[PDB]
């Protein structure tokens, strides 16, 4: 099936639990499509910004899996303000910040913080995270789950 096909099932607000069946399927799909990365970030940005917490949560988990399964071609897309601004809008009180849940917000920050470490190459990711702090959105570096592959 198609990218949206996979994502829709992988982020369905009805799911009783995470369905890693579709999460991985969305990932390999991205790895097949000549424009999988470009298309995927756009799709993910939208799901992550959904008013339905469970949909955004699953979307974030899917985004996390793509970071580990879709290599550099995916990283490059995430490392752009085009996508990053969409995540900022989720935690920034100026935009969607005052409506999104603490669950979604902290998850997003955890990931951004994580990427500044794992992808020292992606300067835009650092600038994005740094702003969030300089703007009081993030009071301090959050603790994160142990993952030794984060270089």
């Amino acid at each position: 099936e198609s990218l949206e096909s996979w994502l829709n099932k992988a982020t369905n607000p009805s799911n009783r639990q995470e369905d890693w069946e579709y999460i991985i399927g969305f990932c390999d799909q991205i790895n097949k499509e000549l424009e999988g990365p470009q298309i995927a970030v756009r799709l993910l940005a939208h799901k992550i910004q959904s008013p339905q917490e469970w949909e955004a949560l699953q979307a974030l988990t899917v985004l996390e899996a793509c970071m580990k399964n879709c290599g550099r071609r995916f990283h490059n897309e995430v490392g752009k303000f085009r996508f990053l601004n969409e995540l900022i809008k989720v935690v920034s009180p100026k935009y969607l910040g005052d409506r999104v849940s603490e669950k979604v917000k902290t998850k997003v920050i955890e990931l951004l913080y994580s990427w500044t470490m794992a992808l020292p190459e992606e300067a835009k990711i650092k600038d994005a995270y740094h702003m969030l702090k300089r703007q009081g959105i993030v009071q301090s570096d959050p603790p994160i789950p142990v993952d030794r592959t984060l270089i």
């Binding site: 752009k80 303000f81 085009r82 900022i88 835009k124 600038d127 702003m131």
Partner: peptide, 5 residues
Amino acid sequence: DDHLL
């Protein structure tokens, strides 16, 4: 690509 928010 554009600029940061």
